[PDB]
């Protein structure tokens, strides 16, 4: 009946983006964990101390690590959260009943983990008022980004009520895609990430991931189930929280373990 | 009449708390500023790096200093934000058209700046699952606190939409009253803080500042005006956002100068 959902935010965001989905899922009896990834939300590290996508994803992987033996979770990742979900799946495929991508980057096993990032960066090249910066690890320069207010308003939170946008102004922080780290890491494997069930949730009104890109990702790495939500925007957990919850219910009804 | 409201959160919280009130005020034409104090919200410092009430308050004092000459603000402070308001008022009285205390601590000028914190701590001595810790700085011992989830749900966010409680759990951080530092500070001045207009907004359903403590505060240092909100809880900016906005529009009409 019920599942354990692990909700995973995108870059520049935090656990807080799930403030309205989480209690909605709890009403149905589900367990929900919403994590801050490294240097995200109220984690104390700044992004400039995080060197790799692996470090960035550490709170998810140590949560997965600690899951008692036999317990499984449905991972839910928005936007870049998709990447994290694949990393987690590649190390802990036995601990995952499914992974849901909601307006999310959905990597494959055939190409470099950067593949869908590189493709996204080519089809959405106008960041508006976003500010870009750099910092260094011992041997690499990493690009950081602080999302611009006008980008957020117009492209992310387009049909979210104004308070969500206000909240995002109050809480978003400097993040990174770790694109170059992604381009040089080992591909995700068929036995890890390639063995889990994948559900892909999207809307064609997303003003950041346009429909030909999302259609492209679906075709590139065919998921087990696709759900297209009408209207809304990039932040479906904000703009269409109830519908998203109803889809997550059905995903739990399919993939969650049954109890004796 | 419009105003420039400066909204000041309590300890363990941040600017985020104002996420529903800010846009509501803005719709009426007001300018709103909502700041993160030191080591709060997404400020990058941890509370264990902050030694004094002053240091804690620094982003509000900085913003007041920055205010172009002639401009005035209406300060609004929730809970322990009322102590920051008093510190600001004492340094920049002439920049303050009024100070609004929203179920807030409201210090005076006759007693030590800690006085209402000391009283509060006797009136509400059970903090449930709140975690208390100390840290060291210089030659002082300082108490940190991380609000318990149960204390927050039962006593702070009791009539708030469930999603606001959920935010709180995702965002609240370790904070401090800096009680010891307030006990040794010089008293607020009659000429500075004592000269500003103070509006006191409250509800008798607040489950952390109960009514006999709020009445004690109002009796101790009589405000210029009182508004009592029916229902709600300690977090009126989330539980009664619209009625708070309406009160603030009236405070603006009364206090905020004609150009």
Residue numbers in the entry:
A (entry chain A): 2 to 261
B (entry chain B): 2 to 260
Sentences from the paper on this structure:
A reconstructed ancestral hydroxynitrile lyase, HNL1, from the α/β-hydrolase-fold superfamily is the focus of this paper.
The model contained six glycerol molecules, including one in each active site, and 192 water molecules. Crystallographic refinement resulted in a model to 1.96-Å resolution with an Rwork/Rfree of 9.0/11.6%, and other statistics listed in Table 3. Therefore, the native arrangement of HNL1 is as the dimer like the modern hydroxynitrile lyases discussed here. The larger phenylalanines in HNL1 push the side chain of Trp128 out of the active site by 1.3 Å as compared to HbHNL (1 Å relative to MeHNL), thereby creating a larger substrate-binding region in HNL1. The active site volume of HNL1 (143 Å3) is larger than the active site volumes of HbHNL (94–119 Å3) and esterase SABP2 (123 Å3).
